[PDB]
Design a protein around this ligand. Structure first.
Ligand code: 2X5
Ligand code: NI
Length: 400
């Protein structure tokens, strides 16, 4: 292999509203646009009319649909989705030339799940069974794909971030390569960090720098209470203490400009006149990730072109306006699109590792580029992993 032409450019989306892939469900195939989400583990599709859906999965139209006679209820921070579990035939038209029988959660009711204008009608959870709902016995899509076909246990993502239009958000594109690595999608070295545990795609950050300046924190703070690689999150999200330190450093480096507090909170845009954005006043951010070798790390470095998100405003379309896309977390580090848009990211499930290489499509300028660099060696490395306190709820679970 080394080339997967038919799968290149199979992702679409609107800036800040997630990347989706075309999928078909049922016999005959019903086409739906599905959010590619490495931060969840259910395949769930709209299956009833909704204000924001132009279309939905029609179970009755599918000769191959089977009801599992079990419901599912998924609450979260922003809202909830719920529905009926079943199985049906699933394919990815611009993916591998295979059809599989997968679990599908047919979403019958939801609150603040679907997004007006996003153009997606469902979610493809690509993480592991451990975080599937209602429980880990509901096989995720990718597990079924690998078990039922000869597709190698690996996928890779090239998310290409963003203007033509003032009335709508900017269109984005990218590639999901299932079963391999496409060498046309990256340049330079591909560096791997271990998947610490197979639930989320959990990784370990050992060091953080802002414009070459070490944040000098106990490295467990970087992974408190976890660090994950998540295509279903827009922002780089950082643990409270890390967020505060990072913002302070970025503020100081960019101090020639005085932005409102709303900007640093991601609640307000800042603008410059077309093409005059002073990129050079904003620092690079480096995350050092644990290497496959003990005592080694490598760094991924992103630019303000990644963490400042373009939003073309109607009232001031002569200007280039940006949202600050680094935000606070209380559930650990989330390396979302802000990180992933810099890189070609290889989810090597077979070898329990995640690969990063400089993306052939990343946004940069003539002075700086997103980078992937290593090795960095450290004498006698402290364990940077955090151990989440075990609740009685969690401890009570039997795993046969
Ligand atoms: N990983 C991740 N997936 C989550 C939350 O975190 C998600 C994301 C979006 C979503 C909305 N707008 C833009 C993007 Cl990139 C994603 C919309 C719904 C949505 O549902 C959440 C359901 O619970 C699992 C995690 C899901
Ligand atoms: Ni038991």
């Amino acid at each position: 292999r080394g080339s997967f032409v038919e799968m290149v450019d199979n992702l679409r989306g609107k800036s800040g509203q997630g990347y989706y892939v075309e999928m078909t469900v049922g016999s005959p195939p019903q086409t739906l646009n599905i959010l590619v989400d490495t931060g969840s583990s259910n395949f769930a599709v709209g299956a009833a009319p909704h204000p924001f859906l132009h279309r939905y999965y029609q179970r009755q139209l599918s000769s191959t649909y089977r009801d599992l006679r079990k419901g599912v209820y998924v609450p979260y921070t922003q809202g909830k989705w719920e529905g009926e579990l079943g199985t049906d035939l699933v394919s990815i038209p611009h993916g591998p030339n295979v059809t599989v029988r997968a679990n599908i959660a047919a979403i019958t009711e939801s609150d603040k799940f679907f997004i007006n204008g996003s153009n997606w009608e469902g979610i493809l959870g690509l993480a592991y069974a451990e975080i599937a709902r209602p429980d880990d016995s509901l096989e995720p899509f990718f597990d079924s794909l690998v078990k039922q076909t000869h597709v190698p246990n690996l996928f890779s993502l090239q998310l290409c971030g963003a203007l033509n239009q003032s009335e709508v958000l900017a269109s984005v594109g990218g590639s999901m390569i299932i079963g391999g690595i496409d060498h046309s999608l990256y340049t330079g070295s591909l560096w791997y960090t271990p998947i610490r545990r197979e639930w989320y795609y959990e990784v370990i950050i050992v060091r953080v720098e802002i414009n070459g300046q070490d944040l000098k924190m106990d490295c467990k703070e970087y992974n408190y209470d976890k660090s994950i690689v998540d295509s279903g999150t827009t922002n780089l999200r950082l643990p409270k203490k890390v967020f505060e330190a990072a913002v302070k450093s970025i503020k100081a480096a960019s101090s020639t400009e005085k932005f409102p507090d709303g900007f640093w909170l991601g609640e307000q845009l800042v603008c410059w006149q077309a093409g005059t954005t002073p990129w050079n006043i904003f620092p690079v951010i480096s995350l050092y990730l644990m290497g496959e070798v003990t005592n080694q790390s490598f760094r991924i470095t992103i630019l303000p072109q990644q963490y400042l998100r373009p939003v073309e405003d109607v009232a001031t379309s002569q200007d280039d306006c940006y949202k600050f896309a680094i935000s606070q977390s209380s559930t650990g580090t989330v390396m979302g699109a802000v990180i992933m848009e810099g890189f070609y990211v290889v989810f090597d499930r077979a070898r329990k590792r995640i690969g990063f290489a400089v993306s052939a499509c990343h946004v940069h300028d003539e002075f700086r580029t997103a980078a992937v660099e290593g090795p960095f060696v450290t004498l006698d490395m402290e364990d940077c992993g955090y151990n989440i306190p075990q609740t009685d709820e969690s401890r009570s679970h039997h795993h046969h």
